Design a protein around this ligand. Structure first.
Ligand SMILES: [K+]
Ligand SMILES: [K+]
Ligand SMILES: [Zn+2]
Lengths: 363, 5
């Protein structure tokens, strides 16, 4: 039936407290509501992840550390560095409970898909793909994407994770590196010095999972048309080789023109074409957010993509709502690319695509 | 380990 939208006021307020994206969850929800898109979705309150759920991926020692520093927001605990807390991942007061709420929200979305409540379930505050079993990383404390995939494994036999965030989805890839039940596909900036430093085209997984990880390394300045060409070519091959039964799709908006990271040069329309390609498979699909550090642009992007999921054309004028002034001075939904070079050469992209095709022959 | 951020 209609898509599930994971939401409650309390959940949004928790998500608004994440250190690197304050208020973003409220801006995203507010804009979706301003376009009245929530009236076309089934709103489902998220459940909080239990300790037992979190521990099916994360280690007890890491969960215990996170819970300890979370209680009073001890951002000066001497053991935080072993567990990845520090600059990227501060010990914000309450972060254990906020992260458990986000993990629970993604698990709730997955359960809705299993129950056949919907074909698409959305958690725009999820997508924290860098967290490791025993380590916070990259603004991620608990890996809600992994938790969602592990929930989907109850029913859906083969699962495709597609990560369109600017950064390599390394924590998800690592979690499933040794298995062939989950294929991971990440398109990301790959350049030495650029976080997290992994995900070359030669990274294909390990052991029994060899060839069940796909990485598409891309350079600065990519725009909508070339990005979609790459994404469609890879997903066509993956779909035919792997025959997934469910998809988890991470749509971090840090690729979008105007992001302070200033790396890719995408608009929501290009990402929307990738999303449409996946939706036409008509599989259970769990939609996640992720990065995105121009907050108004991230809200523009995810609102537009919610419209794509609903098959609706949205008005270009930003409607009046709580954060209307954040969209000035032009107050439009569309984003214009920057005037900078695309550093992706056609011969290199072709070689990457050919290398991936050769890998997928083994699948 | 890299810094993100
Ligand atoms: K990615
Ligand atoms: K895998
Ligand atoms: Zn990112």
């Amino acid at each position: 039936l209609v898509p599930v939208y994971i939401y409650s006021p309390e959940y949004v307020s928790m998500c608004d407290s994440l250190a690197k994206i304050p208020k973003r969850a409220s801006m995203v929800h507010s804009l979706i509501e301003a376009y009245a898109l929530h009236k076309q979705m089934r709103i489902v309150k998220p459940k909080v992840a239990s300790m037992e759920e979190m521990a099916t991926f994360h280690t007890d020692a890491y969960l215990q550390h996170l819970q300890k520093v979370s209680q009073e927001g001890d951002d000066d605990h001497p053991d935080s560095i072993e567990y990845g807390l520090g600059y990227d991942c501060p010990a914000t007061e309450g972060i254990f409970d906020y992260a458990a709420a986000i993990g629970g929200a993604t698990i709730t979305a997955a359960q809705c898909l299993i129950d056949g409540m919907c074909k698409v379930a959305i958690n725009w505050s999820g997508g924290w793909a860098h967290a490791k079993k025993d380590e916070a990383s990259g603004f991620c404390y608990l890996n809600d994407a992994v938790l969602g995939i592990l929930r989907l494994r109850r029913k859906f036999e083969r699962i495709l994770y597609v990560d369109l965030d600017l950064h390599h989805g390394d924590g998800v890839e690592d979690a499933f590196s040794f298995t062939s039940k989950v294929m991971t596909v990440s398109l990301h900036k790959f350049s030495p010095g650029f976080f997290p430093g992994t995900g070359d085209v030669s990274d294909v997984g390990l052991g029994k999972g060899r060839y069940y990880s796909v990485n598409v390394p891309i350079q600065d300045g990519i725009q909508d048309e070339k990005y979609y060409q790459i994404c469609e070519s890879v997903l066509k091959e993956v779909y035919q080789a792997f025959n997934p039964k469910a998809v988890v799709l991470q749509l971090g908006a840090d690729t979008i023109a105007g992001d302070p990271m200033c790396s890719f040069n995408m608009t929501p329309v290009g990402i929307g074409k990738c999303l449409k390609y996946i939706l036409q498979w008509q599989l259970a699909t769990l939609i996640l957010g992720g990065g995105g550090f121009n907050l108004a642009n991230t809200a523009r992007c995810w609102t537009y993509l919610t419209g794509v999921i609903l098959g609706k054309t949205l008005s270009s004028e930003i409607p009046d709502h709580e954060f209307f002034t954040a969209y000035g001075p032009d107050y439009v939904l569309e984003i214009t690319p920057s005037c900078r070079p695309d550093r992706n050469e056609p011969h290199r992209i072709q070689q990457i695509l050919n290398y991936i095709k050769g890998n997928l022959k083994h699948v | 380990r890299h810094k993100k951020x």
